[PDB]
Amino acid sequence: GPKRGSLVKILRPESYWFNQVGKVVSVDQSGVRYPVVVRFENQNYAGVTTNNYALDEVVAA
Amino acid sequence: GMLETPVTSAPIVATYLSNLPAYRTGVAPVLRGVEIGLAHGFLLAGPFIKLGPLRNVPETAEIAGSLSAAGLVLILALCLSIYGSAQFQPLFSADGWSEFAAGFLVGGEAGVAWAYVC
Amino acid sequence: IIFLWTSGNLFHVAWQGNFEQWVTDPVHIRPIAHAIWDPHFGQPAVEAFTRGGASGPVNISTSGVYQWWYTIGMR
Amino acid sequence: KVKIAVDRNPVETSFEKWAKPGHFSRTLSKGPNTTTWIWNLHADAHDFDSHTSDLEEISRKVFSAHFGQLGIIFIWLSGMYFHGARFSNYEAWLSDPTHIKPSAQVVWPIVGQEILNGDVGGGFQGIQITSGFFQLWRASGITSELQLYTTAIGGLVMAAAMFFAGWFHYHKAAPKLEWFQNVESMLNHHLGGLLGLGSLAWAGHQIHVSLPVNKLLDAGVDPKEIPLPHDLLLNRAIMADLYPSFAKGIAPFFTLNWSEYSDFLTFKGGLNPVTGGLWLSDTAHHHVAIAVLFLVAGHMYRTNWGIGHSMKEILEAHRGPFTGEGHVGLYEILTTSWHAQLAINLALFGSLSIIVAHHMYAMPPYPYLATDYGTQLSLFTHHTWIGGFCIVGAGAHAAIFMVRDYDPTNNYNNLLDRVIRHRDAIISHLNWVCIFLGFHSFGLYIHNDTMSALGRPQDMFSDTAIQLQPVFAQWIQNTHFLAPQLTAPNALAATSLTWGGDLVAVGGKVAMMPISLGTSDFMVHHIHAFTIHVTVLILLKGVLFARSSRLIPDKANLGFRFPCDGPGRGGTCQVSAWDHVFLGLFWMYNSLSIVIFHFSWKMQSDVWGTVTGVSHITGGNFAQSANTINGWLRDFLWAQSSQVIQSYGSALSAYGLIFLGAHFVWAFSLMFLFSGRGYWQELIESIVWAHNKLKVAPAIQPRALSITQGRAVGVAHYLLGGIATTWSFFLARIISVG
Amino acid sequence: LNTIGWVTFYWHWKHLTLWQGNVAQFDESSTYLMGWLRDYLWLNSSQLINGYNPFGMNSLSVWAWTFLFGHLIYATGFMFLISWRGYWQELIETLVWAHEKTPLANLVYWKDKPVALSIVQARLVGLAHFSVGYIFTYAAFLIASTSGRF
Amino acid sequence: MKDFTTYLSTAPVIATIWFTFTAGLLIEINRYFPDPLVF
Amino acid sequence: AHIVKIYDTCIGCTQCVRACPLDVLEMVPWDGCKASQMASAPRTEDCVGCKRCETACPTDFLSVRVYLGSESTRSMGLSY
Amino acid sequence: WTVPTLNPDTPSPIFGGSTGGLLRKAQTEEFYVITWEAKKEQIFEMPTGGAAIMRQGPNLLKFGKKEQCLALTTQLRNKFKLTPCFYRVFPDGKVQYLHPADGVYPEKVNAGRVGANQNMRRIGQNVNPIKVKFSGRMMSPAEI
Ligand code: CLA
Numbered sequence A: 001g002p003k004r005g006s007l008v009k010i011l012r013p014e015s016y017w018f019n020q021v022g023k024v025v026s027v028d029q030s031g032v033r034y035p036v037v038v039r040f041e042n043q044n045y046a047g048v049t050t051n052n053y054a055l056d057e058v059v060a061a
Numbered sequence B: 001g002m003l004e005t006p007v008t009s010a011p012i013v014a015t016y017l018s019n020l021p022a023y024r025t026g027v028a029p030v031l032r033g034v035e036i037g038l039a040h041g042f043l044l045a046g047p048f049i050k051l052g053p054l055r056n057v058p059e060t061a062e063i064a065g066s067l068s069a070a071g072l073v074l075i076l077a078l079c080l081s082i083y084g085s086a087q088f089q090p091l092f093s094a095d096g097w098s099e100f101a102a103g104f105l106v107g108g109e110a111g112v113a114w115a116y117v118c
Numbered sequence C: 001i002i003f004l005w006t007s008g009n010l011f012h013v014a015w016q017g018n019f020e021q022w023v024t025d026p027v028h029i030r031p032i033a034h035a036i037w038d039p040h041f042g043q044p045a046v047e048a049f050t051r052g053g054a055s056g057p058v059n060i061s062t063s064g065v066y067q068w069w070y071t072i073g074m075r
Numbered sequence D: 001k002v003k004i005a006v007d008r009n010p011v012e013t014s015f016e017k018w019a020k021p022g023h024f025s026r027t028l029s030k031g032p033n034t035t036t037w038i039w040n041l042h043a044d045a046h047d048f049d050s051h052t053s054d055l056e057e058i059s060r061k062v063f064s065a066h067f068g069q070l071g072i073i074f075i076w077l078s079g080m081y082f083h084g085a086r087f088s089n090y091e092a093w094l095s096d097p098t099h100i101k102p103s104a105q106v107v108w109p110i111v112g113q114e115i116l117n118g119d120v121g122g123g124f125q126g127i128q129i130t131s132g133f134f135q136l137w138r139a140s141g142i143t144s145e146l147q148l149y150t151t152a153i154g155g156l157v158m159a160a161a162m163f164f165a166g167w168f169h170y171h172k173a174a175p176k177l178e179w180f181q182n183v184e185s186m187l188n189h190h191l192g193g194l195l196g197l198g199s200l201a202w203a204g205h206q207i208h209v210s211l212p213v214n215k216l217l218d219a220g221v222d223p224k225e226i227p228l229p230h231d232l233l234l235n236r237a238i239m240a241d242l243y244p245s246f247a248k249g250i251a252p253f254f255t256l257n258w259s260e261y262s263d264f265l266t267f268k269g270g271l272n273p274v275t276g277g278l279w280l281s282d283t284a285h286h287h288v289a290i291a292v293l294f295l296v297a298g299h300m301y302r303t304n305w306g307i308g309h310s311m312k313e314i315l316e317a318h319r320g321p322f323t324g325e326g327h328v329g330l331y332e333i334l335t336t337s338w339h340a341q342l343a344i345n346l347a348l349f350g351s352l353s354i355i356v357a358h359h360m361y362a363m364p365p366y367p368y369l370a371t372d373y374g375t376q377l378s379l380f381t382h383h384t385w386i387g388g389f390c391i392v393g394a395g396a397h398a399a400i401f402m403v404r405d406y407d408p409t410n411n412y413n414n415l416l417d418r419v420i421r422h423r424d425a426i427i428s429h430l431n432w433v434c435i436f437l438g439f440h441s442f443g444l445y446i447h448n449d450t451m452s453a454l455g456r457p458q459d460m461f462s463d464t465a466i467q468l469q470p471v472f473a474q475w476i477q478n479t480h481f482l483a484p485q486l487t488a489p490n491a492l493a494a495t496s497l498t499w500g501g502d503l504v505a506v507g508g509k510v511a512m513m514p515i516s517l518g519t520s521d522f523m524v525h526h527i528h529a530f531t532i533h534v535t536v537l538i539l540l541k542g543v544l545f546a547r548s549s550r551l552i553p554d555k556a557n558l559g560f561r562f563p564c565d566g567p568g569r570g571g572t573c574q575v576s577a578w579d580h581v582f583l584g585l586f587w588m589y590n591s592l593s594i595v596i597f598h599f600s601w602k603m604q605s606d607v608w609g610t611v612t613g614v615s616h617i618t619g620g621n622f623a624q625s626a627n628t629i630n631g632w633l634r635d636f637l638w639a640q641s642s643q644v645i646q647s648y649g650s651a652l653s654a655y656g657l658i659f660l661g662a663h664f665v666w667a668f669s670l671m672f673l674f675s676g677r678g679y680w681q682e683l684i685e686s687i688v689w690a691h692n693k694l695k696v697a698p699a700i701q702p703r704a705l706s707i708t709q710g711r712a713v714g715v716a717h718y719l720l721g722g723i724a725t726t727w728s729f730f731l732a733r734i735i736s737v738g
Numbered sequence E: 001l002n003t004i005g006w007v008t009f010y011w012h013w014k015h016l017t018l019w020q021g022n023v024a025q026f027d028e029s030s031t032y033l034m035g036w037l038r039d040y041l042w043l044n045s046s047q048l049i050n051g052y053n054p055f056g057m058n059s060l061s062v063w064a065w066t067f068l069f070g071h072l073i074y075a076t077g078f079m080f081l082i083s084w085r086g087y088w089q090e091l092i093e094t095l096v097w098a099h100e101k102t103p104l105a106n107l108v109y110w111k112d113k114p115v116a117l118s119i120v121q122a123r124l125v126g127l128a129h130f131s132v133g134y135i136f137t138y139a140a141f142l143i144a145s146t147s148g149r150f
Numbered sequence F: 001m002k003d004f005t006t007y008l009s010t011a012p013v014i015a016t017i018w019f020t021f022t023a024g025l026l027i028e029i030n031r032y033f034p035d036p037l038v039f
Numbered sequence G: 001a002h003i004v005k006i007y008d009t010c011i012g013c014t015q016c017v018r019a020c021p022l023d024v025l026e027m028v029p030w031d032g033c034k035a036s037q038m039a040s041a042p043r044t045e046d047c048v049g050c051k052r053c054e055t056a057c058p059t060d061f062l063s064v065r066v067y068l069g070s071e072s073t074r075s076m077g078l079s080y
Numbered sequence H: 001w002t003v004p005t006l007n008p009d010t011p012s013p014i015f016g017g018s019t020g021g022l023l024r025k026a027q028t029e030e031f032y033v034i035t036w037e038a039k040k041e042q043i044f045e046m047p048t049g050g051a052a053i054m055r056q057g058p059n060l061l062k063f064g065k066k067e068q069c070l071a072l073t074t075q076l077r078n079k080f081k082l083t084p085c086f087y088r089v090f091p092d093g094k095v096q097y098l099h100p101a102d103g104v105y106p107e108k109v110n111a112g113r114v115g116a117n118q119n120m121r122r123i124g125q126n127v128n129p130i131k132v133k134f135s136g137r138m139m140s141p142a143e144i
């Protein structure tokens, strides 16, 4: 999918960083359901700055 | 295990608790009830006489005190009856606790009546 | 429950209130709600809650039912 | 071997770590991402256990911290003396103590606040102070403002020395761990040098400066005309003119003919009748005795020579059949855990402050203090509050020890272990006795309210109906009044007027009279017992179940301060020992508010007042009114808040403003106490959206306060509000009717 | 409760100053909150708290008792609103131990296991005591002041 | 000295200096212009 | 008994398993994530609902959820 | 690996006896019994309060709830590096083994386990509460 270092936008509506911009770390090329690893500069309520997303949940914008 | 203590595991305390009528293991529940009632009604007759609302009116302090004590003994016997009705569905059975509550009623009213004479 | 509540208000006013005395001078006579039977009372309380014009201890109503009933035709 | 052990130059003095907030914590030095960080930065700033595991570095940190505290206190004392010298009416007050109000604060004439500078007398305008510094200064023999100014400069110099000592003993020459662990030497030096030499040098100052100057002040001579103290030291013939013992010098001291020093080392007792304070000769003998006693006490523990006791040997020697190993292991605990020491010292320091309050109201030690009713009320109340806070702190740091420092593989079948091992029995018995006390103590008040309301006063618990006389306290009172005749032959009077006896009055006001004890005093004392027992229940339960309970078996791993363990198992909110400190704080407030109300009403009703017989401030209403809640509500609160509610347009208007403000802050606390941070976080989410819409969302993410910070903010504003309310009430009342 | 307390303090005090005659008292004292606390709460609760006293009682003693009754229920609701569950659950566990170990009373045993109140139940019970004490306090004060002074 | 000015650039120090400046400015205005209600 | 569910966003970090104070969860073989590990809740009858598992989960949103259901003697954490 | 059995004649750790021990739940409902084999004699903290010396060899303690046995298991497993196991005992004498019910501890994957209570969807893909109204009981929409 998207490449390393590119900026994407999250469309998972029950996420902390929905409708916000992060940075792709890696995309796993196996049959994993959520391969897109996106870091965010701000943390959520659990103090986490990294989440895994699917292909149709990220838009390179 | 349980904490070993000279209050919970004293010999003379264990014999004294074995001699009290809640523990004799072989007397009738009616006899346990009448002995516990003759103790408790006789002791409950006191403060209603000495401290109640009619305590300073002569010739009627002991009457109203014993009458309120008898009413309280009747309330306690009703409490025993509903406890046995809710609990079990020789002393620890429905028939045994009903006999125990009736014996407590009889013994408590007899203790109040004996405290009125005394 | 609502109609039983209203019937109870009417019954305790009719039996324990001063409604037939209130309607003659409604400026100077206090409306009585219901009589007091409290065996925990003492004689100063029985004397002080016997306000007027009552036989024994009564409560003075603030619920305003005498004005409403006298306006809609109760006498 | 006890010796000086110091490491050279541990920490460089540099401004680098000032420019890096949260340097002390590995978690907090990463920087701020959300707003929670800030609060964490201030909450854990002085929690040195969470900084390092090394006991030495922690010990050094607390040492320099203590130096910082002492320097701050010296700045405070310097300020009080300077304000007493430059912005006060102290000399005028010295000329006429009975008709001039002590004032040492003046406000500037802006926005109308000038009205607070009231007519305190002496041709002065300011705020009347109730700290009692004027009486302390007159008792010390100070007569001029110059001496106070010099004391201010001296205290400022000492503050600079304390801050230098802090910087020096942290950054240049910081003591080693085994220096701090010399507890035997520390006790010897503090019992001899601190308490002993302290009271010795103070008795020196008293005998040489206080006694002659205050004897002349009681004689009536103008303060400016009294000889300066250095002339009292220099020419001993004047000292022989007041007390002929001084003619013989120190010859009766060394020859053991001490009886000739009975001119200035007395045992009179009672109060100075023209002055209303304890005799300074009694206080001088007292401090000499105290000095000799403590210097004897300070030579008990072995240091660098064979003689002397050993603390671990005395502890390990007291073992019985009921307790097993007894006091074994306690020495190791109290020489390696700062929190255990802090808990013990806080408990005894708070208790000591409460004892100070009672002994200073009952036996007024300063001249013209007993008749300055505002000062007496203020001092008692203040030191009682300080006491209570330090006791709650003791329970807090006890629990902190229990979670962080407790280690049973050096502490195995011990006093502490058995306490932890029968804690259920302890807490259940305390529980029952608290319910018993509550039922019978409070139930008498409710009973009285009901009987009084039902028109049956003859059925109440009172002095005329069903009496409940404090026979034991009355017997102890009578015994202590009869004590000078038989069991204390060399005493001229009793130690306090409140035992019984005559009446000492100064300037038309009652200094002290015999305090009678009836059914109302019985009822309030059992209320006090109840509230104290409940407070002990909460705090002690907090410390005994800090590690584990049947509900949370592994509570120790969750820490000392944590919100809960989730809504499961029915709900585990406020299971942490910190939350037990939080509830103990509320209950301590309850207890001490009833205590200071007892003191205030009782003093204004049965003790204080003018002498014509004695007309009391409230006419003696205590004995009949303090048996119902309505009586406290009407005759105390409602009646005595007249002064505060009508203080507007005068110099006491600030007490009305702080009355309203304190009520406001108290109510403001309820928002934090009654709610929870989930709601507030979601509200903040909406507000954050609004800020995002206008490109004003901060980079540091707005977060609702934590659960424990919500509780902390709650209890802090609650305490501030309530205490300040009673403060404004008390001060306005007693200054206006005093 | 706060908002209706504001509207009823306001209604009651403006009508008390109307019924007495001096509306100038409300016009002068309602512009500052000390005037509220002095001239509506302190002033109009003199005959209320004198309903019973060590000199006797009168007809307003029931409203004085209900006034204190409401202050007490309010204060008791503060306990459920401030203190939360796990303290009470540990306390009840110690009580369960104390009942099961006491001789001659452990022959009587509960059928329902005693636990503490739940969190939602705590909020409801605290708000209930809070509101009942609020209503009884203000109803006692309002009825007693308006009936005693007119 | 760079680190001391960085510390003086921190949030509570600047809030203290700025509120001292703002409060002092208001105090001097209310001194030289006593009690302004209008204009 | 409470309701504990596992969702397919699990990355098999095992954090939830090592957080439960009651041993309710365990890790099973799976092929949906790189770790080839998924949580599972075969013993929800002993679950008290403390929600330590939800605290330990790193994913956004949660992959383990505890719905407080009917209470029993085991779910109330009663030792009596 | 096979399921072990309870030896009732296993020596208990050295402990003077607490007030936080068993209650009538042990006699009427159940009590849980923990067992481990120690390498040396060493003091541990009892989860019901107090210190106790374990014996060299097998040990045996009985607790009132499961969380006490997990707390002692976690303590003996992280601090002492031991492998305990605790059972479930009924007043009839019925013994129910668990933890590790697989034999391998649940904090690492083992073949043969069957996944229970696994929804194969996201949490945002749950249905609305209108879709599960008027069933036989209360239902959260995550139940389906
Ligand atoms: C809790 C405090 C308290 C106390 C001490 C009292 C006391 C009294 N009340 Mg009051 N009352 C109270 C609260 C209290 N009340 C409250 C809160 C209210 C409002 C709800 C009232 C409303 C009220 C009314 C309306 C009246 C009273 C009356 C009385 C009097 C007689 C009551 C009576 O006969 O009971 C009977 C007494 C007992 C059953 C005693 C039981 C307690 C025993 C002694 C415990 C023994 C424990 C023992 C030491 C253990 C030994 C163990 C060993 C054997 C192994 C008595 C002086 C009456 C009165 O006329 O007042 C003068 C009356 O008419 N009260």
Ligand code: CLA
Binding pocket: D011, D012, D013, D014, D015, D016, D017, D018, D019, D024, D060, D061, D062, D064, D065, D067, D068, D072, D163, D164, D165, D166, D167, D170, D171
């Ligand atoms: C004046 C020169 C000076 C300099 C440059 C330093 C520098 C340092 N000190 Mg040292 N030290 C000094 C003097 C100095 N100190 C003094 C006078 C004391 C005695 C108090 C100490 C005792 C000391 C201790 C115990 C420790 C340090 C530590 C440190 C280091 C980090 C602390 C920090 O950055 O926060 C700077 C802190 C502040 C700027 C706030 C000051 C708080 C003041 C003292 C409290 C009083 C304010 C007062 C109550 C007013 C309140 C009014 C109202 C709002 C309530 C840093 C190298 C720490 C360290 O090395 O950790 C590894 C450490 O633990 N110092």
Ligand code: CLA
Binding pocket: D075, D076, D077, D078, D079, D080, D082, D083, D087, D105, D106, D107, D108, F013, F016, F017, F020
């Ligand atoms: C320790 C307790 C203490 C307290 C509560 C007070 C309180 C007061 N003093 Mg007193 N005073 C004290 C000690 C104290 N003083 C000491 C130790 C001295 C000897 C130095 C004095 C000498 C003194 C004089 C000569 C006067 C007062 C005055 C006053 C009154 C007004 C103060 C004012 O507005 O200053 C002005 C306000 C400021 C200067 C605000 C500036 C604060 C800065 C910007 C903070 C910057 C933060 C910084 C990092 C930390 C400070 C570092 C520091 C080294 C500057 C006030 C009642 C005045 C008075 O009583 O009038 C009748 C007055 O004339 N004081």
Ligand code: CLA
Binding pocket: D062, D063, D066, D067, D070, D179, D180, D182, D183, D185, D186, D189, D190, D192, D193, D194
């Ligand atoms: C007999 C000598 C002596 C005296 C008078 C003191 C006095 C004190 N020590 Mg102790 N201390 C001593 C010996 C002494 N110490 C020894 C031998 C040890 C090692 C075993 C310690 C280890 C020690 C520790 C770890 C701590 C103290 C602290 C204190 C202070 C407690 C605060 C207080 O309430 O005082 C009332 C306040 C005063 C009376 C102010 C006057 C103080 C001046 C400086 C006179 C005290 C004499 C001083 C020791 C001489 C210093 C000379 C120096 C230039 C070398 C108090 C000032 C605590 C403290 O607060 O440290 C800052 C503290 O944490 N001491």
Ligand code: CLA
Binding pocket: D200, D201, D202, D203, D204, D205, D207, D208, D232, D233, D234, D235, D236, D239, D245, D246, D247, D248, D249, D250, D253, D261, D288
């Ligand atoms: C503890 C504090 C204290 C202090 C500081 C004093 C001090 C004094 N007392 Mg007092 N006294 C005290 C407690 C104290 N007393 C108590 C508790 C009692 C009750 C028992 C008394 C009862 C009492 C009586 C009855 C009398 C005194 C007297 C005195 C004075 C002379 C004593 C003397 O001759 O000592 C011996 C001399 C010394 C100890 C000399 C000090 C050492 C010097 C300073 C060393 C200098 C060395 C240095 C290298 C040289 C300077 C060099 C430099 C210039 C470069 C002296 C001012 C007498 C007096 O004058 O009354 C007004 C007197 O008659 N006292």
Ligand code: CLA
Binding pocket: D042, D043, D044, D045, D046, D047, D048, D346, D389, D390, D392, D393, D394, D396, D397, D400, D561, D578, D581, D716
């Ligand atoms: C000898 C006195 C003493 C000392 C040295 C300590 C020391 C400590 N306490 Mg202890 N404690 C004490 C007494 C003491 N305490 C008292 C009297 C209480 C009862 C309130 C407690 C109750 C207590 C609790 C519940 C806790 C501590 C904790 C701590 C530790 C960290 C504190 C910290 O960094 O907070 C930083 C300091 C602050 C945040 C100060 C703000 C405090 C309030 C908000 C200010 C009060 C308002 C003020 C008086 C006036 C405001 C005026 C105006 C602005 C409106 C530290 C070891 C904590 C800990 O975790 O220990 C390991 C902890 O949780 N203490």
Ligand code: CLA
Binding pocket: D431, D432, D434, D435, D436, D437, D438, D439, D442, D443, D446, D534, D537, D538, D583, D584, D586, D587, E072, E075, E076, E077, E078, E079, E080, E082, E083
């Ligand atoms: C005025 C309001 C109020 C009242 C009545 C209580 C009452 C109590 N608190 Mg609570 N508390 C309060 C405010 C209050 N608290 C607040 C605001 C907080 C938050 C800070 C707390 C937080 C708190 C803690 C942390 C603890 C308590 C505990 C207790 C109990 C103490 C045991 C006792 O003395 O039993 C005696 C009962 C009473 C004094 C209540 C009144 C009884 C009346 C007068 C007589 C009863 C007879 C009655 C009239 C018959 C009615 C019949 C009718 C139903 C038909 C007691 C029930 C403690 C506890 O439970 O341990 C033992 C405890 O640890 N409370």
Ligand SMILES: CC1=C(C/C=C(\C)CCC[C@H](C)CCC[C@H](C)CCCC(C)C)C(=O)c2ccccc2C1=O
Binding pocket: D671, D672, D673, D675, D676, D677, D680, D703, D704, D705, D706, D707, D709, D710, D711, F015
């Ligand atoms: C009101 C309330 C909040 C909200 C309160 C918050 C978020 C604190 C707000 C403090 C200030 C107002 C915010 C920080 C201000 C900064 C210093 C910004 C600078 C402002 C300048 C004017 C100096 C909670 O978070 C909470 C949490 C748990 C239980 C109860 C409650 C609770 O009752």
Ligand code: SF4
Binding pocket: D563, D564, D565, D566, D567, D571, D572, D573, D574, D676, D707, E084, E119
């Ligand atoms: S979150 Fe607040 S409420 Fe929910 S459990 Fe933890 S503490 Fe109790």
Ligand code: SF4
Binding pocket: G009, G010, G011, G012, G013, G014, G015, G016, G017, G038, G039, G056, G057, G058, G059, G063, G064
């Ligand atoms: S549930 Fe959360 S924590 Fe447990 S495994 Fe799946 S992801 Fe890791």
Ligand code: SF4
Binding pocket: D568, G004, G019, G020, G021, G022, G023, G024, G025, G046, G047, G048, G049, G050, G051, G052, G053, G054, G066
């Ligand atoms: S809730 Fe408590 S028990 Fe249920 S899973 Fe999360 S942790 Fe394990």
